[PDB]
Amino acid sequence: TSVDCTAYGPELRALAARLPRTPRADLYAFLDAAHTAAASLPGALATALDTFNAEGSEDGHLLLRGLPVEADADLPTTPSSTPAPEDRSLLTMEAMLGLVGRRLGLHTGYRELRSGTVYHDVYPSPGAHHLSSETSETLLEFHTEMAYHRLQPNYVMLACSRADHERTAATLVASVRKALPLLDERTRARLLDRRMPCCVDVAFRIAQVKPLYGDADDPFLGYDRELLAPEDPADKEAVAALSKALDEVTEAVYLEPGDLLIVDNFRTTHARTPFSPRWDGKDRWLHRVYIRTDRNGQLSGGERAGDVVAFTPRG
Ligand SMILES: N=C(N)NCCC[C@@H](C(=O)O)N1CCC1=O
Ligand SMILES: O=C(O)CCC(=O)C(=O)O
Numbered sequence: 151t152s153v154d155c156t157a158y159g160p161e162l163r164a165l166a167a168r169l170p171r172t173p174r175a176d177l178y179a180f181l182d183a184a185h186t187a188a189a190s191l192p193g194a195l196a197t198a199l200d201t202f203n204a205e206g207s208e209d210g211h212l213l214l215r216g217l218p219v220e221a222d223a224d225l226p227t228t229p230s231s232t233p234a235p236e237d238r239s240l241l242t243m244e245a246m247l248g249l250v251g252r253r254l255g256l257h258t259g260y261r262e263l264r265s266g267t268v269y270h271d272v273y274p275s276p277g278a279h280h281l282s283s284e285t286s287e288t289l290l291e292f293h294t295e296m297a298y299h300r301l302q303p304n305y306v307m308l309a310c311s312r313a314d315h316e317r318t319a320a321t322l323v324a325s326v327r328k329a330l331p332l333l334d335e336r337t338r339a340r341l342l343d344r345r346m347p348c349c350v351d352v353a354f355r356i357a358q359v360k361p362l363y364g365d366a367d368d369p370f371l372g373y374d375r376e377l378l379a380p381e382d383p384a385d386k387e388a389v390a391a392l393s394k395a396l397d398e399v400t401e402a403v404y405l406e407p408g409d410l411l412i413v414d415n416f417r418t419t420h421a422r423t424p425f426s427p428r429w430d431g432k433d434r435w436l437h438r439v440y441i442r443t444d445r446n447g448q449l450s451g452g453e454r455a456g457d458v459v460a461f462t463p464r465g
């Protein structure tokens with residue numbers, strides 16, 4: 151699902167201006183400011199976000215296109231390391247992630263991942279491990295983010311400050327609502343609420359993940375093409391059928407500056423196709439944040455946007 155927000159550029163730049171200019175120096179205060187500001191988002195945007203937050207969509211994602219973003223010459227050089235300096239001045243796309251994110255829920259950091267930071271720069275790095283956001287020429291295969299984590303976030307948000315030079319990197323999204331009809335009843339039944347072994351991402355180095363769960367007529371999805379590891383042959387067969395159906399309903403988003411993609415991380419799996427970096431200071435640069443909501447299991451009470459949580463595997 152996509153919406154063009156170009157007309158709201160002036161209003162959104164004004165809301166971004168309300169926020170503290172050094173977010174990381176006091177992230178709780180920054181996000182509280184973003185929460186107050188999210189109450190004044192343009193009506194069209196507030197409605198679109200509230201609707202997607204409550205109902206999801208058939209395609210599992212909401213793409214906000216044409217949000218404000220700096221001219222390329224005014225952006226810093228694309229980062230070459232992580233984590234980001236705490237004193238880094240606020241970037242417009244980060245302000246959008248603050249506003250849109252707080253309208254949806256609570257930004258969450260994960261202790262063992264990216265030093266526990268909340269805002270992650272997603273850029274290519276030479277010699278990247280194959281299972282990392284730093285990859286470029288190697289396809290980053292389908293994964294439901296932290297599917298193996300008990301405190302897995304409802305949304306993964308990606309805002310784009312720079313696309314890759316040739317605009318070949320595609321963010322792929324496959325939705326359980328489109329894939330499910332393609333599976334037979336026995337396969338659905340086998341997957342539903344059935345715990346299967348799942349490895350974890352490098353940062354967290356098992357877990358048990360239910361590939362499908364919840365209401366049988368509209369289940370949630372937990373899938374990872376690299377980490378999910380069924381052993382029983384019936385389980386492997388069912389996951390292979392699920393994998394094929396997800397491929398068959400794959401949709402692609404070519405992120406460009408000003409785009410903010412909201413992925414329903416309980417109903418999709420996502421990936422990124424290859425691109426060739428130039429190491430010239432203008433390489434692809436996205437900003438990633440994770441949002442927790444009241445959808446069950448994520449929050450137990452007293453949480454604030456900006457909190458960092460520890461690792462506990464599902465099981
Ligand atoms: N199939 C996979 N699990 N691929 C790795 C996903 C990217 C990775 C990263 O940020 O480098 N990550 C996502 C959460 C985490 O860690
Ligand atoms: O680069 C992208 O478009 C998505 C990256 C991603 O999914 C990840 O690093 O977890």
Ligand SMILES: [Fe+3]
Pocket residue numbers: 293295306420
């Ligand atoms: Fe991801």
